[PDB]
Amino acid sequence: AERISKQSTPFVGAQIFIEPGQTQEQIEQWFKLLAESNMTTCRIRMFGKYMKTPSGTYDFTLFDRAFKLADKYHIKVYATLFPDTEFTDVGGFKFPHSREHQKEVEDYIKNVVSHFSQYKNLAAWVLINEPGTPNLPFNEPFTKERFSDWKKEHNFSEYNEKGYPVLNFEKENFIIDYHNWYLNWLANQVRLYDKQHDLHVNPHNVFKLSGLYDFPTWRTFLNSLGGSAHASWHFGYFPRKAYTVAMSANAELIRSGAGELPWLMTELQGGNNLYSGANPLCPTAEEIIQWLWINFATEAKGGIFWSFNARSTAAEAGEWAMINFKNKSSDRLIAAATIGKFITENVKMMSNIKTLNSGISILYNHESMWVEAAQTRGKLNGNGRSIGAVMCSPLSYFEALSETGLQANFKEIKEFDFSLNDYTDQVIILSHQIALDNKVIKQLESFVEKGGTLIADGLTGYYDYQAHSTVVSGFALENLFGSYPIEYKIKENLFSLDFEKDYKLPAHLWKGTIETSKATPIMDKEGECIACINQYGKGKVFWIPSPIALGARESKDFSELSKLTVSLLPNKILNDNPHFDKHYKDVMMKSFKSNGTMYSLIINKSASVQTVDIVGGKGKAFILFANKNAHSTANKLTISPEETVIIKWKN
Amino acid sequence: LFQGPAERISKQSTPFVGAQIFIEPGQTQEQIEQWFKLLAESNMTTCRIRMFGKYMKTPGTYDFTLFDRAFKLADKYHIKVYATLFPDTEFTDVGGFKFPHSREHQKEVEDYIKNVVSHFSQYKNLAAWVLINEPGTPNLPFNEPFTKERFSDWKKEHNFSEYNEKGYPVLNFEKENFIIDYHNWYLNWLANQVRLYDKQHDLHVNPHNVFKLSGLYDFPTWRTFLNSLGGSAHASWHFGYFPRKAYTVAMSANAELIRSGAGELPWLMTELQGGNNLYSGANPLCPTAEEIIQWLWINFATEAKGGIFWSFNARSTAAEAGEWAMINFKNKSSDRLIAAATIGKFITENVKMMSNIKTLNSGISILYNHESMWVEAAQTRGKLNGNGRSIGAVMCSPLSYFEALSETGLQANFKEIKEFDFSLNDYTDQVIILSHQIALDNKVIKQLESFVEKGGTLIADGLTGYYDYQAHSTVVSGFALENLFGSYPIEYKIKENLFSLDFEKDNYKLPAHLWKGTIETSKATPIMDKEGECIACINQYGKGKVFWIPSPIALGARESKDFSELSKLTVSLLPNKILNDNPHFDKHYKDVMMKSFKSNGTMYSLIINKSASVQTVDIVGGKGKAFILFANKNAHSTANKLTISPEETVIIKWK
Amino acid sequence: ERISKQSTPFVGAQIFIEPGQTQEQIEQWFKLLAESNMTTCRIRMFGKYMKTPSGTYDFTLFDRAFKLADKYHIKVYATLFPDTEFTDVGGFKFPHSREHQKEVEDYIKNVVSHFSQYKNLAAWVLINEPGTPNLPFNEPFTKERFSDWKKEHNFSEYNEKGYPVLNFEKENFIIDYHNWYLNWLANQVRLYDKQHDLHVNPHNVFKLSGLYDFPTWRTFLNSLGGSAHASWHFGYFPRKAYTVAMSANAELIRSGAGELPWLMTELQGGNNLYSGANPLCPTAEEIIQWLWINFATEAKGGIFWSFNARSTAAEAGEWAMINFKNKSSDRLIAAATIGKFITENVKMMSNIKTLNSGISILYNHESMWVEAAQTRGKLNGNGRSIGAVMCSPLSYFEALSETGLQANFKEIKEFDFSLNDYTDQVIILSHQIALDNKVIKQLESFVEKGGTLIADGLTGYYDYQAHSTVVSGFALENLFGSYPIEYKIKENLFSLDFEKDNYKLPAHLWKGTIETSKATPIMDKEGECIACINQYGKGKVFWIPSPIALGARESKDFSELSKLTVSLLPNKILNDNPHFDKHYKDVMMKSFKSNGTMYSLIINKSASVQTVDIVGGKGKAFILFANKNAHSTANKLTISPEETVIIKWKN
Ligand SMILES: *[C@H]1[C@H]([NH3+])[C@H](CO)[C@@H](O)[C@H](O)[C@@H]1O
Ligand SMILES: *[C@H]1[C@H]([NH3+])[C@H](CO)[C@@H](O)[C@H](O)[C@@H]1O
Ligand SMILES: *[C@H]1[C@H]([NH3+])[C@H](CO)[C@@H](O)[C@H](O)[C@@H]1O
Ligand SMILES: [Cl-]
Ligand SMILES: [Cl-]
Ligand SMILES: [Cl-]
């Protein structure tokens, strides 16, 4: 069996939806067109329901038929373990209902892995479709008992070391461990019967569910990390014109979770929402090209569209499909096929992509999300006093950097390597990460001391991991920030921070004021201290405790956040990295390397032709890919609305 | 002419204006008599009385005194009585329970019916038993043991497979099919209970909120045990899909829907809004005098044998205290009772005309089906965002065609598909509109094929035929309507709530809602858009034609608040016979309606102006010269050009 | 000291005591509290922070605070707060069970026996914020109480005339239950301490007044308190009208107090981060506005929640008057100027008596209870929603404030109907939809003896059993000399245009038409009778059954309601009371006396400097207090935006 690696040739693929009632002739027609569309790979939901016989035997006929047709057309198969469940359960159950249900899942895995492991075109086992749920079944006896046991095996005090009352977030910490346990158990079950094939899983809705996911632990039992990134389900924090930024951030978040493992996008939106989806659309041909290039530029080893063909009955009947109702190519399949073709014509380049890390890392942590949920009491008013602000804030910095043509990592804090001796020319952005503990503050102190630049806005560091505010009891970040908070004063959803001898930064909801000791104060036109720069060892801290990233989001203008961030970056980042000479609204660029050669991905999401002046790095623009005849004069790229451009930098 | 001295309602009965007389303890003889006196002097012949079990129960005997007093005063003033069976229930239960709570409760209802029917059947002024007030509820009591057991029994008596004949997974809509049968069962049982003690009087029932609850109602089965079909059509409860200026269209569609359900049975509007919402109602108003006249004429023009207003007098305590009443707090006439009285007077002065009304059927039938509503509910997961991806699109779509036709002065039927007669040999000059009827089975497609083959015109827009009755999409597995449509769907692509379909020829633009459908023609003639995609087709099929446009253009007209393009398109697809034989407008008129009817050979037209300004409407088609028989604001006509004032109702007699 | 109507008013603040705080921080709070001219603190006596493992009480944490309060001559309001979940911010309102009642008995024994011994104990607060909309009917203690209460009451389903009735068993039980538990808490405290003032702080009074029988509470209290938080309680008002909100809240508590002194136990001292329904940070200007409105309305104190902040989870670092360095915000500096003013004007400030104009705006429990039943709990902010029966009188109150006229705001049972003369007294019953025969007789007596009655909206539509006499035989026909004909629903906003071409009154939702017998009809331009004046004995009735107060609210314009009301007032009120020569949008004035000397409080909440012409009473304006250099020429006051002015009337 071929094992996926960081050197694998990336593929374009699609879900092949198999259910009873389909004919041999239609299934073969799908695989034939899939092969002719320069797609190498399919994914198949191995429905327990469509293998169970009245007598309790497994009948594999329906899936044998699909596997054999895949083999005939040289299509490899991601096989999703999907035990028997209600027809109306679109996504699948996330945990066993009971010990008896766990034994049924054991029996399902034994039967399905023993049989289908024998196919030479099996590429991977997907352990579970879309692990993680917002609504965890605490009512079910399996989960209820696990939670009880877990609580008794942990020693939690109602008071901290200094004697203050604490929250311990038992539920949230259990949920991490519970996901870790069940996925690890699924991996172990598959490994009883098959030690040959890649294990894969697709975390989903990552801007909401990242607080469920311990990706470092998952690396211990996976061969690749996947992802669902559906424009109609997962990008609600963005307008459609910014699904570029959404896909880029989703790619960076999975990339970070993957660490040393290769990653691929297991599930992308391939077609139309009729009745399904939260933010329904039909992806344009242009969007299909944009999403594949963003993922490959971000080291994805694959892009699998849900779906090639449609479900026939009830939920998503005739929805999501890349083929039309005559089983011929939509403009979406035609577009995906040009990327498959491009890969086969540029194998060495496409097989060795490494994202050009600017040195900027935007960090989020589970605990800021958990404290936000407790403090907002689950309010959904889309603002700082609602669930989502601790993710929308870093996503806004990410967007501002994208509109500057700068790559940024998007990482959980435990995925950042704090063990290096030098962080010269490395930048951490902590945007409204409202919960930081002593351990992480010490890591941040080390990082800055050794040359790191730390940018902190919003209520970053207001609470610890027990929702205790050191801002009240004795500020844990006083040392690093060389300053102390004075007040937060709530304002409108959108106000202006007007710096002395003007920046006018858009700010959201709260004005923070500080007192500097070691730091240099920055004053506003009202004579209040609203920010500071602390020189700490070899590094610097910029602290502005008003939410200026959420301000940029609220004002729908990232230009001031771009200019401010650029002015704080070490010169080395601006000299070594291709970026825009200025901020461009609704334009993104990210750069990658493949065997020594540097490339740039440019996408224009504005309503008009843009001329983007690319500066930094070395080389002359050669246009390798452009779906609307983009042209460059020196390093000035003229790019049409919705166009995707790959520049190869020659020399 | 054997089972009763009781007058039995017929399609030949003289229509009446009437009102609820609300009877509760605490009222005096003097006030009740004053109500019946004024009711009689307002040219009303009929009242309806809720026979509250609560106000007859003694510390277990029945005391009938409170209702005897009302029946005797009704009799004294020659007022006939619709008596509503309303068993004992909480004072706070405004509308009444819809089903027994338990086997023990069913026995209490049996005892209630025995006592009340045995006693009040003896009054010579009893016109009808209303079996239940407003059968049907959105929120069915599945948690109560009587319903839970009935559902369990019904499930064990039905054999459902999880797969169809081709092997595909299916939904079976057990809940929805049970609910139809459960309503059928309980109403039939109520009819049987009444018939144990009285075989002389008309059985009546008033289905309500029909644009939402039609999926609960099997009117063909109800005909089996009713003598007349009723209806509640309240401007404050039932017309949420319409602005107030289109309550004319709402009432006309509600009348057509009940008319269709009635079939051979006479029908009447059991419950119309007679007065003011204080705290009650979803879309509160006080009907204008003009609105009262509009609603009575729309119903009579649509073959109603009665209009009964809720209410003559008001409830006194809590819910709807001093609300809904046609009389003011001094028990004298509001402008609403004075207006209703002019229609009562008109009827007594034109008995033969008013007793024999038959709606002039244009030949256009707008069809809805239970199953499109049920599949919509499952697919939209009960979303209430008032659009294609919400509950109500499958009804708002046909209602939009209906509105477009009303603004063209054309009658259209509004019928459940099982109420349409598919058994005829000729459908020349007949038109079916299937607007966003997303669920169609093989049986109905065969009926539609027969209909078109024999000369029928089929107009289909939106996602009509996307699913079958098991929510299986033949669009995915093998399109069941390919033969009839002479074409095949290619894609739906979601767009904004309002977009334009830009036709390749003639620079022609249709408002469309939410989804753009593209097709491939085989036998049909393709119609292309400016982007070179096929968006519609005309299939010639035997003697008939099919127009198919799988974008929602009716919902597009609704979203744009403009039915003028939908009017022009529909008119251009009608057989010439419909335009030549039927009075209609020479063009589309925004916020004007006309419907025509016949009575013993003579043709009439009803015209209502709901616009802000005086309109001159050019009436064309049929034969005759306009004579203005009824006009509440001095309408005048020159030849067949009618000048009609805002909120005016006009009846033209064609000489 | 025992509090009296002659006590010197104080400024004070909550001192929030929890484990983890140091001696040094607590002392620093009391030191700054003393230096801020604050004499009083309030301390939550958390049962949780006195319970030891063994069930003994350890008082150490509160001893430390009491002793530091004593050292700085700070008196203490001690709040009885039994053991409860850390997450319970406001405290439980009733015992959970008979066993929990015994724990509360033991808590009171231990805490009152111990802390009664401190010489700086000013008051026991029996319970923090009595009243909850949602009573725990599920819990056995409340379930049994309701069962017992129901068996002790005989309710008939019909009235005397035979009509069906509602009896509001739940609402009547809830009044009696609050009466019972507070009385029981008072009796428990009195078992161990007969020396100290008993106090309680009713809250959210514009919503919870239907829970509160203040006349009964007088029997076991020495003072009535109040929570009046801008972020929780003033939802019916924009921020620019929090002056009117505080004035109405002060009047409502003052009325409940009767002969008892009252003080505002809980005012907003600082910032909402995540807490509050209508979040803000009070301005310095707002702090001064609220203290003066309360003192002008006879308050013996203003206690801010809070001096210092909670440290963990709910309201962590929120509400505090001190900043995170434990120094003065502009809010503490502002509060300190009022403390200083009091020490420099002891005799004036100790003897304040509100100058009663003679205008009383009456609300009743029963209008609120019938509204809840008729609106079925709808929250659409209009006549068909919960809150109209309170927003309506609050709108008259606002119109009178913008005329510079004091008005009482009273529950109908708090109005003295037993006098022989009501010459030059005015009652406004605005949309008080429920009136019984007893109250109609009191209103007949009041008008007969010279009273002026103003009734708008659906006043008197129902009786106390939600039976409408408008339908069965109008109970107010005699007093009104007229009969309702119809209500007709209209738009949210329409105009009642009087035929005499004077008044064009904004009206909300319903147009009422009437038939006059004894009364003089007032016709509108459409030829309908919309109002009347009835001469009844020596008094007059103005009846307009359209909601013109809710009309003024909906139009955000109280000017026509002001002019109409002024034209109906007895001459004596206009001659004897300082008021404005005309209506001033977003300006308030209320007047008070201290011994013989008359004063006026003027606040400008408009965006611009106003010149207000004060007329009525006697004297020349001398500016005693002004925080933005107000000046007067004769009796014309020039007052800046957000400025508070006290005028002393010299002669
Ligand atoms: C992912 C995605 N959610 C599809 C479209 O909603 C769904 O049908 C499948 O269950 C995939 O897991
Ligand atoms: C019909 C209608 N719902 C009336 C107004 O709400 C009501 O009083 C009656 O109970 C009928 O339900
Ligand atoms: C009063 C007020 N509700 C405070 C602020 O929300 C709260 O912390 C206190 O518990 C008091 O209830
Ligand atoms: Cl899958
Ligand atoms: Cl009835
Ligand atoms: Cl307290």
JSON list of N, CA, C and O in Angstrom, two decimals, chain C residues 214-234:
[
{"chain": "C", "resi": 214, "resn": "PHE", "atom": "N", "xyz": [-44.89, 46.87, 49.30]},
{"chain": "C", "resi": 214, "resn": "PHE", "atom": "CA", "xyz": [-44.01, 47.75, 50.11]},
{"chain": "C", "resi": 214, "resn": "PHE", "atom": "C", "xyz": [-44.73, 48.14, 51.40]},
{"chain": "C", "resi": 214, "resn": "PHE", "atom": "O", "xyz": [-44.12, 48.13, 52.47]},
{"chain": "C", "resi": 215, "resn": "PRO", "atom": "N", "xyz": [-46.05, 48.47, 51.38]},
{"chain": "C", "resi": 215, "resn": "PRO", "atom": "CA", "xyz": [-46.78, 48.70, 52.63]},
{"chain": "C", "resi": 215, "resn": "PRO", "atom": "C", "xyz": [-46.58, 47.58, 53.66]},
{"chain": "C", "resi": 215, "resn": "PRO", "atom": "O", "xyz": [-46.27, 47.91, 54.77]},
{"chain": "C", "resi": 216, "resn": "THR", "atom": "N", "xyz": [-46.68, 46.31, 53.30]},
{"chain": "C", "resi": 216, "resn": "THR", "atom": "CA", "xyz": [-46.44, 45.21, 54.25]},
{"chain": "C", "resi": 216, "resn": "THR", "atom": "C", "xyz": [-44.98, 45.25, 54.73]},
{"chain": "C", "resi": 216, "resn": "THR", "atom": "O", "xyz": [-44.76, 44.96, 55.91]},
{"chain": "C", "resi": 217, "resn": "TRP", "atom": "N", "xyz": [-44.03, 45.56, 53.84]},
{"chain": "C", "resi": 217, "resn": "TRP", "atom": "CA", "xyz": [-42.58, 45.47, 54.17]},
{"chain": "C", "resi": 217, "resn": "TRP", "atom": "C", "xyz": [-42.22, 46.48, 55.26]},
{"chain": "C", "resi": 217, "resn": "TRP", "atom": "O", "xyz": [-41.33, 46.17, 56.10]},
{"chain": "C", "resi": 218, "resn": "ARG", "atom": "N", "xyz": [-42.85, 47.65, 55.23]},
{"chain": "C", "resi": 218, "resn": "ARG", "atom": "CA", "xyz": [-42.69, 48.73, 56.23]},
{"chain": "C", "resi": 218, "resn": "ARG", "atom": "C", "xyz": [-42.82, 48.16, 57.64]},
{"chain": "C", "resi": 218, "resn": "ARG", "atom": "O", "xyz": [-42.08, 48.64, 58.51]},
{"chain": "C", "resi": 219, "resn": "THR", "atom": "N", "xyz": [-43.72, 47.17, 57.84]},
{"chain": "C", "resi": 219, "resn": "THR", "atom": "CA", "xyz": [-44.00, 46.58, 59.18]},
{"chain": "C", "resi": 219, "resn": "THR", "atom": "C", "xyz": [-42.78, 45.89, 59.79]},
{"chain": "C", "resi": 219, "resn": "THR", "atom": "O", "xyz": [-42.78, 45.77, 61.03]},
{"chain": "C", "resi": 220, "resn": "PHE", "atom": "N", "xyz": [-41.77, 45.47, 59.03]},
{"chain": "C", "resi": 220, "resn": "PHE", "atom": "CA", "xyz": [-40.60, 44.75, 59.60]},
{"chain": "C", "resi": 220, "resn": "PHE", "atom": "C", "xyz": [-39.27, 45.40, 59.19]},
{"chain": "C", "resi": 220, "resn": "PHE", "atom": "O", "xyz": [-38.24, 44.90, 59.63]},
{"chain": "C", "resi": 221, "resn": "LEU", "atom": "N", "xyz": [-39.28, 46.47, 58.40]},
{"chain": "C", "resi": 221, "resn": "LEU", "atom": "CA", "xyz": [-38.03, 47.16, 57.99]},
{"chain": "C", "resi": 221, "resn": "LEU", "atom": "C", "xyz": [-37.88, 48.45, 58.81]},
{"chain": "C", "resi": 221, "resn": "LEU", "atom": "O", "xyz": [-38.88, 48.99, 59.25]},
{"chain": "C", "resi": 222, "resn": "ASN", "atom": "N", "xyz": [-36.65, 48.95, 58.91]},
{"chain": "C", "resi": 222, "resn": "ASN", "atom": "CA", "xyz": [-36.35, 50.31, 59.43]},
{"chain": "C", "resi": 222, "resn": "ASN", "atom": "C", "xyz": [-36.04, 51.24, 58.25]},
{"chain": "C", "resi": 222, "resn": "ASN", "atom": "O", "xyz": [-36.21, 52.45, 58.41]},
{"chain": "C", "resi": 223, "resn": "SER", "atom": "N", "xyz": [-35.58, 50.71, 57.12]},
{"chain": "C", "resi": 223, "resn": "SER", "atom": "CA", "xyz": [-35.35, 51.52, 55.89]},
{"chain": "C", "resi": 223, "resn": "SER", "atom": "C", "xyz": [-35.66, 50.68, 54.65]},
{"chain": "C", "resi": 223, "resn": "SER", "atom": "O", "xyz": [-35.47, 49.41, 54.71]},
{"chain": "C", "resi": 224, "resn": "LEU", "atom": "N", "xyz": [-36.16, 51.32, 53.59]},
{"chain": "C", "resi": 224, "resn": "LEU", "atom": "CA", "xyz": [-36.30, 50.63, 52.28]},
{"chain": "C", "resi": 224, "resn": "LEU", "atom": "C", "xyz": [-35.10, 50.99, 51.41]},
{"chain": "C", "resi": 224, "resn": "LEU", "atom": "O", "xyz": [-34.69, 52.18, 51.40]},
{"chain": "C", "resi": 225, "resn": "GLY", "atom": "N", "xyz": [-34.51, 49.99, 50.76]},
{"chain": "C", "resi": 225, "resn": "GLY", "atom": "CA", "xyz": [-33.39, 50.15, 49.82]},
{"chain": "C", "resi": 225, "resn": "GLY", "atom": "C", "xyz": [-33.86, 50.03, 48.39]},
{"chain": "C", "resi": 225, "resn": "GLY", "atom": "O", "xyz": [-35.09, 50.09, 48.14]},
{"chain": "C", "resi": 226, "resn": "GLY", "atom": "N", "xyz": [-32.91, 49.80, 47.50]},
{"chain": "C", "resi": 226, "resn": "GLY", "atom": "CA", "xyz": [-33.13, 49.70, 46.05]},
{"chain": "C", "resi": 226, "resn": "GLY", "atom": "C", "xyz": [-31.83, 49.42, 45.33]},
{"chain": "C", "resi": 226, "resn": "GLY", "atom": "O", "xyz": [-30.80, 49.99, 45.76]},
{"chain": "C", "resi": 227, "resn": "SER", "atom": "N", "xyz": [-31.86, 48.51, 44.35]},
{"chain": "C", "resi": 227, "resn": "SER", "atom": "CA", "xyz": [-30.88, 48.42, 43.24]},
{"chain": "C", "resi": 227, "resn": "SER", "atom": "C", "xyz": [-31.47, 49.19, 42.05]},
{"chain": "C", "resi": 227, "resn": "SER", "atom": "O", "xyz": [-32.62, 48.92, 41.66]},
{"chain": "C", "resi": 228, "resn": "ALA", "atom": "N", "xyz": [-30.71, 50.15, 41.54]},
{"chain": "C", "resi": 228, "resn": "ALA", "atom": "CA", "xyz": [-31.05, 50.93, 40.34]},
{"chain": "C", "resi": 228, "resn": "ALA", "atom": "C", "xyz": [-29.78, 51.01, 39.48]},
{"chain": "C", "resi": 228, "resn": "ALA", "atom": "O", "xyz": [-29.06, 52.02, 39.57]},
{"chain": "C", "resi": 229, "resn": "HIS", "atom": "N", "xyz": [-29.53, 49.95, 38.70]},
{"chain": "C", "resi": 229, "resn": "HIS", "atom": "CA", "xyz": [-28.36, 49.76, 37.82]},
{"chain": "C", "resi": 229, "resn": "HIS", "atom": "C", "xyz": [-28.71, 50.16, 36.38]},
{"chain": "C", "resi": 229, "resn": "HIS", "atom": "O", "xyz": [-29.63, 49.55, 35.80]},
{"chain": "C", "resi": 230, "resn": "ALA", "atom": "N", "xyz": [-27.97, 51.12, 35.84]},
{"chain": "C", "resi": 230, "resn": "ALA", "atom": "CA", "xyz": [-28.10, 51.59, 34.44]},
{"chain": "C", "resi": 230, "resn": "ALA", "atom": "C", "xyz": [-28.02, 50.42, 33.46]},
{"chain": "C", "resi": 230, "resn": "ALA", "atom": "O", "xyz": [-28.68, 50.47, 32.44]},
{"chain": "C", "resi": 231, "resn": "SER", "atom": "N", "xyz": [-27.22, 49.39, 33.75]},
{"chain": "C", "resi": 231, "resn": "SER", "atom": "CA", "xyz": [-26.99, 48.25, 32.83]},
{"chain": "C", "resi": 231, "resn": "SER", "atom": "C", "xyz": [-28.04, 47.14, 32.99]},
{"chain": "C", "resi": 231, "resn": "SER", "atom": "O", "xyz": [-28.08, 46.27, 32.09]},
{"chain": "C", "resi": 232, "resn": "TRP", "atom": "N", "xyz": [-28.85, 47.14, 34.06]},
{"chain": "C", "resi": 232, "resn": "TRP", "atom": "CA", "xyz": [-29.84, 46.04, 34.29]},
{"chain": "C", "resi": 232, "resn": "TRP", "atom": "C", "xyz": [-31.28, 46.53, 34.24]},
{"chain": "C", "resi": 232, "resn": "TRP", "atom": "O", "xyz": [-32.14, 45.72, 33.88]},
{"chain": "C", "resi": 233, "resn": "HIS", "atom": "N", "xyz": [-31.56, 47.75, 34.68]},
{"chain": "C", "resi": 233, "resn": "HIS", "atom": "CA", "xyz": [-32.92, 48.12, 35.17]},
{"chain": "C", "resi": 233, "resn": "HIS", "atom": "C", "xyz": [-33.57, 49.18, 34.29]},
{"chain": "C", "resi": 233, "resn": "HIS", "atom": "O", "xyz": [-34.78, 49.42, 34.48]},
{"chain": "C", "resi": 234, "resn": "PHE", "atom": "N", "xyz": [-32.82, 49.78, 33.36]},
{"chain": "C", "resi": 234, "resn": "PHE", "atom": "CA", "xyz": [-33.27, 50.99, 32.64]},
{"chain": "C", "resi": 234, "resn": "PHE", "atom": "C", "xyz": [-33.50, 50.69, 31.16]},
{"chain": "C", "resi": 234, "resn": "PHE", "atom": "O", "xyz": [-33.55, 51.62, 30.38]}
]
